[PDB]
C-alpha cells in the first residue's frame, strides 16, 4: 500500500468506480461578521461567524497541490451582555460563542484525481487528529473612555463523521468533502475587559483566529468515486453567480435613500457652516 | 403493487434505472418581504413575495419522512396605492398580488429513496389535489392615527405540469421536484381597511399564510431515475456557501457609512444638553 | 457534415458519448455597480463590473434557439481619482478598468439536445471571432455645478482558451461553455471631461454597453458529452434559492436602523418647522 492510494475497484466502457486514498493538510480559517448599531457607538448589532473560504496549496510526497477549505459553524450559541439602557453605556446585543453543543463543518477539496469527478462517493471514510481553536484579543473602539477587549477562549476540535459538501463561492462551486468536527471547551477561558463577565468557556466569534494565518489538521480519507472512465470528462467548476439580485436592489433602494438623507443632512450643516 | 414501490426498469453493473412511485405530503409556506421607505413611515416601498423554505417531518406508512419544501410565485401582479405626495398620506409604491395570470411553484425534496442520487429523471408524472391559500390580515404602523390593515384574499391553488428543480438554501442543496399550481381566486377580497381600496380580486403578499403555520396539500408522484446501481453512493446534500462577497461588502460599506452619519447626529444632539 | 450535427461516438445500455457540434451567436453584455458615497454628494463610492445575465432568443436554421448568457469579468485594474480632500471635490473613490491583463467570462448556455445532460464533457474545442466593445457616455450627477462626463475607451475581445462552468441565477442554474476573451486595446480611449485625466486607454465600468442591447459575437463549438442513453432523461434547470439568509437579515436590520433614524430626523425638522 502507500499514503496516496489509486486503486480501480471496477470499471466499464463508460464508467468506473475508482478507490482515492490520500493524505490532505486541511487548513481552515473563521470568518467574523462584525454588526455595529447606530448612535453613540456603544451598542454592537451583533458578531457572529460566518462561513470563510480559504484558498492554498501544499507539498504533497513530491506533488504541489491546491486546495480550497471553507470553514462553518453549527449550534451556535447567543450570548447577551447589557451594561445598561442608556446610549452611554457599552452593550452587545448578541454574540455567537461555540461550545460543546456546537459543531464545526470543515469541508475541503483538492485538485488531485480524487475530486476531479466527485459527483458519486461511497465507503467514505476518514481519520483527523484533534486541534486546538484559541481565541485572540478583540478590541471595540468605543467613542469615548477605557476601551473594552474580548481576550481569551479556546475550543479543542475532535474528528467526527466525515461526509459530502458543496463549497459554493463567487467563482467555483466544487464538490467537497466535509469534515464534522465536535468540540470541547479548553482550559482558556475568554472574558469581557472591562465588564461584569469573566471565567466563561467557549471560544466567541469576535477573534476566532487569534492572528493566526489558518488552522492546519492532517487529516487522510479513503472514498469509493463513481467516475467516468476516460480521464478527459471535466465537470464544470468555474462559476459565474448572480444569486439574490432581489437583496441587490434593495441594497441599491437603501443606498439611494441613504445618499438623498444624508445629501440634505450636508447641505443643512454647510449652509451653517458658510458664514 | 404499493403506495411506496420501489421498481427496477433496468439494471448494469454500474447504474440502474428505478422507478419511485410515493405518496407525500407538500407542506409548503409563503414568505413576504417588507421594505419600508424612509421618513415620517407613512409610505411602505414594496410588498413583496420571496422564495420560502420551510423543513418538516412527517409519518409515512410506518416510517418518518424529513421532507424540505420550497415555495416561489411567479409572474406576481403589481399593485400600488397613494393618496398623493404629501408626506403624511398613506402610500404603497407597488405591492405583489397573486392572480389568475400567475403560478405558484413549490419545489418539494424528501430523505426517501427516491431522491438520494436524483441527477437525471423520466416519465416524470403526478396526481396532485388543489389547495386554498386565503390572506391573513396585516396592520400598517404610523406614527399617529389609524392603523390601515390589509385583510382579506383568497386563491385556489390548483395543480399544473411538473418538474425537476433545484432547492438552493444556506445549508443544503436539493434536486427536487417542482410541482406548478395555477390560481383561481375564491369569493374572499383582499382589501385595505380604512382605506380607497376595496373589492378587489387576488391574493397580496402582506400576510399570505394568514397565521397558519404550513399550507398542506397531498401528492403523489412516480418518476423514473437513474441512479448507480449500489445503493451506498451519495450525493452531496449539504452547502457552504460564500456568494455574493462584493454584496457582503457593499452592506458593510453602507453600515459604515451609516454608522458615521448616526454617530454624528448622536454627537449633534449631544451638544445641545451643555449648560 | 452539416453545422448543427449530433453525432453518436459510443452508446451503451443507459449511456453514450455523444458529440455535439453547433454554431452559436453569443450575445452578452457588461452590469455595473455605482456604488455613490452620502456626503454633499461629489464622491463616488465605487464603479464595478458585476456578473451580468442576458436571456435571448435566435433563429437557428429553421428553428428557434432560446439562450441565456452570462458576462463576467477578472483581473480588472482599479483606477482611483482625487482631485481634492473636501467635501465639494469631485472624487471617484475607485473604478474598475479591464486592459491586456485582464479577461472576459462568457458562459453560454442553450436548450439544445447538446445542453440538455452536460454533466461531463470532453474533447472540447471552439472557434470564436473577436468583438470590438467600446465605452459609452456616463454623466456624474453632481448636486450643484458642472456634470463630468466618461466618454470613450475601446477594447477587442479575442478568442480564448473555452472550458466548462455553470450560471447561477434567482431562476436557473445552467451548465454551461465558458467562453474566455482576452483584451487587446484599441484606438479609442476613454477620458473624464473637466478632468486632468485623459490619454489613457482601457474599457472603464461606467458604461461599457455603450447604450447597445447587447455584444453579439458569432462563434462555434464541438464537444463530446457523456449522457444518459434515453434522451427523455432530464436533469433540474429552474432552481428556488435562499442563498445569503444572513445577508438579508443583516440588510432588514439595517432597513429597521435606517428607518429609525429618519423618522426621527423628519421629526425634528417638523418640530423645527413648527412655530
Excluded at 490532505?24 to 447606530?38: C, E, P, Q, W
Excluded at 476518514?126 to 481565541?135: D, E, F, M, Q, Y
Excluded at 472512465?229 to 443606498?255: C, F
Aim: glycine share 6%.
Amino acid at each position: 500500500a502507500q499514503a496516496n492510494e489509486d486503486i480501480v475497484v471496477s470499471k466499464t466502457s463508460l464508467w468506473k468506480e475508482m478507490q482515492y486514498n490520500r493524505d490532505i493538510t486541511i487548513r481552515f480559517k473563521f470568518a467574523s461578521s462584525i454588526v455595529k448599531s447606530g448612535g453613540l457607538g456603544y451598542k454592537w448589532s451583533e458578531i457572529s461567524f460566518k462561513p470563510a473560504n480559504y484558498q492554498y496549496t501544499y507539498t504533497r510526497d513530491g506533488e504541489e497541490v491546491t486546495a480550497h477549505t471553507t470553514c462553518s459553524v453549527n449550534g451556535m450559541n447567543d450570548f447577551n451582555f447589557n451594561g445598561g439602557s442608556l446610549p452611554t453605556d457599552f452593550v452587545i446585543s448578541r454574540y455567537e460563542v461555540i461550545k460543546e453543543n456546537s459543531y464545526v463543518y470543515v469541508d475541503y477539496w483538492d485538485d488531485s484525481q480524487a475530486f476531479r469527478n466527485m459527483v458519486y462517493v461511497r465507503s467514505l471514510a476518514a481519520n483527523l487528529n484533534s486541534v486546538i481553536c484559541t481565541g485572540g484579543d478583540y478590541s471595540f473602539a468605543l467613542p469615548v473612555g477605557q476601551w473594552p477587549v474580548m481576550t481569551g477562549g479556546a475550543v479543542s476540535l475532535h474528528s467526527a463523521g466525515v461526509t459530502l459538501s458543496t463549497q459554493f463561492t463567487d467563482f467555483v462551486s466544487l464538490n467537497s468533502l466535509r469534515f464534522r468536527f465536535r468540540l470541547t471547551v479548553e482550559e482558556p477561558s475568554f472574558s469581557i475587559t472591562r465588564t461584569r463577565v469573566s471565567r466563561l468557556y467557549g471560544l466567541p466569534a469576535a477573534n476566532p483566529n487569534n492572528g493566526k494565518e489558518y488552522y492546519e489538521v492532517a487529516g487522510r480519507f479513503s472514498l469509493i468515486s463513481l467516475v467516468p472512465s476516460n480521464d478527459d470528462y471535466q465537470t464544470p467548476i468555474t462559476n459565474s453567480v448572480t444569486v439574490r439580485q432581489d437583496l441587490e436592489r434593495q441594497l441599491g433602494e437603501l443606498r439611494e435613500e441613504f445618499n438623498a438623507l444624508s445629501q440634505e443632512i450636508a447641505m443643512s450643516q454647510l449652509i451653517d457652516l458658510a458664514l
